[PDB]
Design a protein around this ligand. Structure first.
Ligand code: SF4
Ligand code: SF4
Ligand code: FES
Ligand code: FES
Ligand SMILES: [Fe+3]
Ligand SMILES: [Fe+3]
Lengths: 633, 633
């Protein structure tokens, strides 16, 4: 099983699934091999009913699509549509939160409210919305209206791009025509230009993709902003992760998906029905997190994280998962069929994300609390049904310190320098105690033994004094392997980084260091990392493509992750990816994405499947940035 | 060559291309066979980087996608993305026209203006925009603003759906949750729900697709509305079609693509530079049309149509095409490479639709006339270069009567009944002189010998007294085979239909009939057919799914055509399609689209590759509708 996952709890459930005959994501992957080489290389097009068209990577015909589309065009069109789909996911998420905030402050959804007034006012100031003499609900109404207006064309560009990046970066992007005009406008324009008989120039197509990736960045940043207003900005929290957080004696309820508009309510309501859970023979309701919805409630409430991404089915294989409450994105639809064998109640809640065989509960913000009680009562029933059955919960979990929003990081640094909090961090970059910053982001992918790239790369970077931050299932991988436990700082961290994490931790009255890796939240919360390094850029008076900052989507899978990697490149970052996207069938497209885009944005993709090589390449990228600043390395 | 095209002019150029070694769309199709059966059946998914995934239509593994996506889900997600891409094309077109109208009436683009004041005022009344006491430019500004607002969520649904369909139809659709909230909103939501780990229920997915197809209908109707305001509502015109409209002695300039915002200017400006063309040794500038941009200027100005769709490369093979002026959609990118051998100057004009190897001229409405003169001067140069070369223009063309906008059809009928113009048409449906109405729409497709399905089906329907209307390349196929020449009414039409076309034509002072087939315009002008049959429904007091009206996308290709076919079904029409979309790999999805969707919308797809069988099935559908009205048949 260690060829499938490096997580020992996942390995134990893989053994249980095998002897019980339950097919897993790894079994379905094995049944897919050999995968189609045209699709893997990107040399396949189905954009019209004259297709499907394919191009042989090498050899004889077919050499060109039926309409005349070249390899370069077919590859760039497919990539562009992946970016648009990712942008559609992150901005559907943000749009939902914008409608929720509007409903809350219009008196139409009383379970939601302005919880972070300070964040509301700073966002309003950032957008140019007046606050002086204005009532909070009216400021919030204007912020929500501004968020919805960024989805379409108007007299301004997308403000959740132009107001969140360094001004010099906005100017570079504007010069190349890369600033999005509207989030859904850009998504639709990608879909149009990539349809048959439209854009057929690789460079033109890819420039469109870069602009659409910034529409995705806007949706991410808007989602984080709105979630913080509604549910609170995260601050440091202590909790646990991996399958051992399940409790045989409790009603185990997983929140799974991305949008915490309902799961945040699930968390608060579950506390109230403790006695009702006790009446059925449970110690209580044990809410646990899967994927990014789990990250959201981990960051804000310390809800323990059960598992992530590729291994999500193994939480049900324990026999102890009474309910899985789903919203949307990254949910393997296999969970609906596996539920028949494991007894889990799988519940969908969102109109546009249903799974055949799962029970649906039509969540509405107006009725959020009643929905949560109906959902939780289905879980309590399910706990009752497994009275006196054996469950196999692996006795495996790690300690997780998390909650490092950008505000929290700045506050932590402010204990070393009250009026200039970023300066202690920059001081330690300059003197070499911090070599640079690496963001780990994105998914697991069944093609890669689960977590192997994240942990192998993180171990090498930490030894070399890199400050490592992480989001989404990159944070999930690192948390499940102990990288968010401060007890492991001595083992994992170079002496310079250890010195800095210790100094910051001791100044925050901890008696010990910050954890080896800083958990910055969910996938939309990659926007928090942007806010941090944008602040660092603005304090140094340089653009992002001069900072020693890199990103690694080390095991990425989802179209959302392709969007994120692409806007990481667009805002100027060297961006490692650990699974090749379908681009190798066009050398000109590969060359743009790995080399010549540097001349446009200063960022670039680093394609490297071998994680030890990837770490060396990321260190090289960091050290080159150090040299360009005249720093030793 | 008659296995490739039924058009004799196309056959002659196919012979020329063969002996000159110029590869054609048919050669590239042959080089693609056998095409991939997973793609052809729809059992392939590339929506995440764990793919590509495929499912064997029959036999052993793989049976399911790696994430657990079933055949039903994979097929429905792929179809939904095709619909969204089509909606993105038609509404990108309409959005461009909305910005052009706004610029024109703000004094920023003086080459554009309100040409159809009556249409402006009727659209404003339809939208609920006040006209009394308002200045035309202010009414137009409000109409343009309303058009742009339909792209995003707001306090009303998409008005270019809810105000253009019969009220009973809007109620049926609203009950099923099918009314779009915003055009680009629906496109983005499709892209989101079809991304990995999201919607995984075939019925839910397909309902989303139906709603997105109505977003496409809105873009079509908005595009026709705005084009008529800016350039004039079409009225009956006489012109010619096929390659023989090229003139060896003239500067032959093709306008090609879909959006006539520039080609309409090309038409008017070309008239002015006649003397400048004469100075270079031409008789003049001969503007000819390809594809829907050609249809637009054929409908409004009688510009002759050169060719269409699959055969577009053969216009250049003549050696006499001096320029091809491109905007976007349905342009084979092969034209840019074929130009090197034929001497044609291929010119792109739209920022998001470039072709490597083609010259680009950045069209802007503000500078429309100067751009046209620069473009036309490139064509005049090219004419000069082919001084004293042999060209091979097939001496083959047909006469084309066209310009049957819905307003023109109603006006024609008004000569038989001034105060109740639809009544003479309904009178003749009831008494059997008109069996029913069939709309031919959509593309040619290299899989089908060019025009064979359109003409075979049209011949059988006309003999059976069906009133036949046509748009896009369906109109192109029928026009190139003589179906828009009133001299062929005796040969083609049953006695009842002949009687009606003659009576209408004689009442319009023609001395002869309307043509056998009524050309209703471009692909967005399928919206005109909707306006006609919606008017008929409202005059009869029934919904569209009770009228003897059907549609045939007999040789369809483009994602735009998939969108159109889907909204034809959604508004209640039996809709024949002549090339299978990638759905046969899921029997449940095929059953929804061909049968059970009847229970939702009253419309349904008729899958029939054999055109004689297709005609029999369309007649059966018409006659069933007749029976449901209690009419003889
Ligand atoms: S768009 Fe071109 S390459 Fe793609 S399926 Fe159609 S003919 Fe083939
Ligand atoms: S979304 Fe599912 S079926 Fe599609 S490529 Fe990814 S794992 Fe395969
Ligand atoms: S030929 Fe396999 S992905 Fe299309
Ligand atoms: S396997 Fe051929 S279309 Fe994907
Ligand atoms: Fe995840
Ligand atoms: Fe066409």
């Amino acid at each position: 099983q260690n060829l499938k996952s490096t997580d020992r709890a996942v390995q134990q459930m893989l053994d249980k699934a095998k002897r019980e005959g339950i097919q897993t994501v790894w079994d379905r992957y094995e049944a897919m091999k050999p995968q189609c080489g045209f699709g893997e290389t990107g040399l396949c097009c189905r954009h019209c009913l004259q297709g499907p068209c394919r191009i042989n990577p090498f050899g004889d015909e077919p050499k060109v699509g039926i309409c005349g589309a070249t390899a370069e065009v077919i590859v760039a069109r497919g990539l562009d549509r992946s970016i648009a789909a990712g942008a559609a996911g992150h901005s559907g998420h943000a749009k939902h939160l914008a409608h929720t905030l509007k409903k809350a402050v219009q008196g139409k959804a009383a379970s939601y409210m302005i919880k972070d007034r300070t964040k509301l006012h700073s966002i309003a100031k950032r957008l140019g919305i007046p606050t002086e003499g204005q009532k909070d609900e009216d400021i919030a109404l204007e912020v929500a209206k501004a968020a919805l207006a960024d989805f379409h064309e108007k007299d301004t560009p997308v403000l959740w791009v132009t107001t969140v990046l360094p001004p010099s970066r906005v100017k570079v992007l504007s010069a190349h025509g890369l600033i999005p005009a509207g989030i859904d406008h850009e998504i639709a324009e990608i879909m149009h230009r990539t349809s048959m008989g439209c854009d057929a120039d690789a460079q033109n197509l890819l420039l469109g993709g870069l602009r659409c990736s910034l529409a995705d960045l806007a949706g991410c940043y808007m989602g984080t902003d709105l979630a913080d207003i509604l549910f609170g900005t995260p601050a440091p929290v202590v909790t646990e992760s991996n399958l051992g957080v399940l409790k045989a004696d409790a009603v185990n309820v997983a929140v799974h998906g991305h949008n915490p508009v309902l799961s945040d309510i699930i968390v608060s309501v579950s506390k109230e029905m403790e006695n009702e859970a006790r009446a059925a023979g449970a110690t209580g309701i044990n809410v646990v997190g899967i994927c990014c919805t789990g990250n959201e409630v981990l960051m804000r409430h310390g809800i323990p994280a059960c598992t992530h991404s590729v291994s999500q089915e193994m939480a049900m294989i324990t026999g102890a998962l009474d309910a899985m409450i789903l919203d949307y994105q990254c949910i393997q639809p296999s969970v609906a069929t596996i539920a028949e064998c494991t007894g889990t109640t799988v519940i969908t809640t969102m109109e546009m994300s249903k799974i055949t065989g799962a029970t649906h509960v039509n969540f509405a913000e107006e009725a959020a609390v009643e929905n949560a009680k109906q959902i939780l009562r289905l879980a309590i029933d399910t706990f009752k049904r497994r009275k006196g059955k054996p469950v196999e919960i692996p006795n495996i979990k790690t300690k997780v310190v998390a909650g490092f929003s950008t505000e929290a990081i700045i506050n932590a640094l402010s204990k070393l320098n009250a009026n200039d909090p970023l300066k202690p961090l920059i001081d330690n970059v300059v003197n070499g105690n911090i070599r640079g910053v690496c963001l780990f982001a994105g998914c697991n992918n069944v093609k890669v033994p689960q977590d192997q790239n994240f942990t192998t790369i993180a171990r090498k970077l930490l030894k070399q004094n890199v400050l490592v931050v992480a989001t989404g299932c990159g944070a999930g991988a690192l948390m499940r392997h102990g990288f968010m436990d401060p007890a492991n700082v001595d083992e994992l961290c170079g002496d310079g980084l250890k010195a800095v994490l210790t100094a910051i931790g001791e100044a925050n009255g901890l008696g010990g260091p910050l954890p080896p890796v800083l958990h910055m939240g969910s996938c939309v919360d990659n926007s928090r990392a942007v806010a941090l390094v944008a602040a660092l850029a603005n304090r140094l008076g340089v653009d992002l493509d001069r900072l020693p900052v890199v990103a690694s989507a080390a095991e990425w899978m989802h179209e959302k992750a392709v969007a994120i990697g692409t806007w990481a490149v667009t805002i100027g970052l060297p961006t490692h990816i650990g699974v090749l996207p379908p681009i190798t069938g066009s050398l000109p497209v590969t060359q743009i994405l790995t080399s010549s885009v540097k001349d446009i944005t200063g960022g670039y993709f680093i394609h490297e499947l071998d994680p030890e090589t990837a770490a060396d390449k990321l260190l090289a990228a960091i050290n080159e940035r150090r040299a360009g600043l005249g720093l030793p390395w």
